[PDB]
Design a protein around this ligand. Structure first.
Ligand SMILES: *[B]([O])([O])[C]([C]N1[C]=C(C([O])=O)N=N1)[N]C(=O)[C]C1=[C][C]=[C]S1
Length: 360
């Protein structure tokens, strides 16, 4: 039976990796030719024995950047900003700073000139500290030349997209983006009524961890969602034409590549590969050196449509959680893997590759 074959494929991909990485709980959701399939493993909380289900809420860390990119896509569709706008055109506090010379595209795609992975520890979640951090920041190298994966970079992109729409980022996401995408189990700030669904995270020590407040955390890494809601967002990405037209345009804006580093083409949020490609190459594109070191970009002469024979993906983590999303536009195939351990990207990609190769 096809259902027995699917469950055997997903079990064989997931179970050894959960054992090898001591993952307490893991949710898979698959979209295959317009039908969803769910597989749930292990414990949302080791302490209280709550099992993972497709409704369990996980922190998805940097997968949040695809939601940030979608809000920016909506600002672009509404003609409220353009990617070649200078960042200081959207925040007067930045006028006179080096953000006079940095584009929204540079911020979105991590090419502003060396904004670091994280805000420094000296910058708390405080509007004045964030403002002052950007006012004083000076590039290490020319804007537009080198990719250095960065929360302050795409965080400021999201913040400025929200300013272009005249409302706070968190409010726009809750009141406009999540409803437009049909997401009722997706949160920046989990309601008290929903906490029973919120999995516990387990740190590299095996200590308990849900994410603490940080500067521009909503824009960079703040989403909590279920495997079922995150697959609804994958299905929106696979079929933008099913949404009302402004939101279809917003999703299309996240499917445009601006430059290549190795095998990876960088979009807004999404990172793309040719498909098929080897597992080792997909792991290398999602490697620690790709995330932590600067890489010279190969700029495309015009944006490339991220569609057809391609895999679009994003990794995301917090101290206690590890998420991965991948989809293949030309095959109507999508995958979500949510776990309550920050386990290596390479292992997330190994599960995903086994499943996507077996769906074929
Ligand atoms: B994201 O998920 O890419 C982003 C950056 N990041 C850091 C790590 C890591 O150290 O393993 N993984 N991803 N996520 C965040 O900045 C949120 C946090 C990462 C660890 C604690 S908070």
């Amino acid at each position: 039976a096809p259902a027995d074959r699917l469950k055997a494929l997903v079990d064989a991909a997931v179970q050894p990796v959960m054992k090898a990485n001591d993952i307490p709980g893991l949710a898979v959701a698959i979209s295959l030719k317009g039908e969803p399939h769910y597989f749930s493993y292990g414990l949302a909380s080791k302490e209280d024995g709550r099992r993972v289900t497709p409704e369990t809420l996980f922190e998805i860390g940097s997968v949040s950047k695809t939601f940030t990119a979608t809000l920016a896509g909506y600002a672009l569709a509404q003609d409220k900003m353009r990617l070649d706008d200078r960042a200081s055109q959207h925040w007067p506090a930045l006028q006179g700073s080096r953000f006079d010379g940095i584009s929204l595209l540079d911020l979105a795609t991590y090419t502003a000139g060396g904004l670091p992975l994280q805000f420094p520890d000296s910058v708390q979640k405080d509007q004045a500290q964030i403002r002052d951090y950007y006012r004083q920041w000076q590039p290490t190298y020319a804007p537009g030349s080198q990719r250095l994966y960065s929360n302050p970079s795409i965080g400021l992109f999201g913040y400025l997209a929200a300013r272009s729409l005249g409302q706070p980022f968190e409010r726009l996401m809750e009141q406009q983006v999540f409803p437009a995408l049909g997401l009722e189990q997706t949160h920046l700030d989990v309601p008290e009524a929903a906490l029973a669904q919120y999995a516990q995270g387990y740190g590299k020590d095996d200590r308990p961890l849900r994410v603490g407040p940080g500067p521009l955390d909503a824009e960079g890494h703040g989403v909590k969602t279920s495997a079922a809601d995150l697959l609804r967002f994958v299905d929106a990405n696979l079929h933008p034409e099913r949404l009302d037209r402004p939101w279809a345009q917003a999703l299309d804006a996240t499917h445009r590549g601006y430059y290549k580093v190795g095998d990876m083409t960088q979009g807004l949020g999404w990172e793309a590969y040719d498909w098929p490609i080897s597992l080792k190459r997909l792991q290398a594109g999602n490697s620690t050196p790709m995330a932590l070191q600067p890489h010279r970009i190969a700029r495309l002469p015009a944006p490339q449509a991220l569609e057809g024979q391609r895999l679009l993906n994003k990794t995301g983590s917090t101290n206690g959680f590890g998420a991965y999303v991948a989809f293949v536009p030309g095959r109507d195939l999508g995958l979500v893997i949510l776990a309550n351990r920050n386990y290596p990207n390479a292992e997330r990609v190994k599960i995903a590759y086994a499943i996507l190769s077996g769906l074929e």
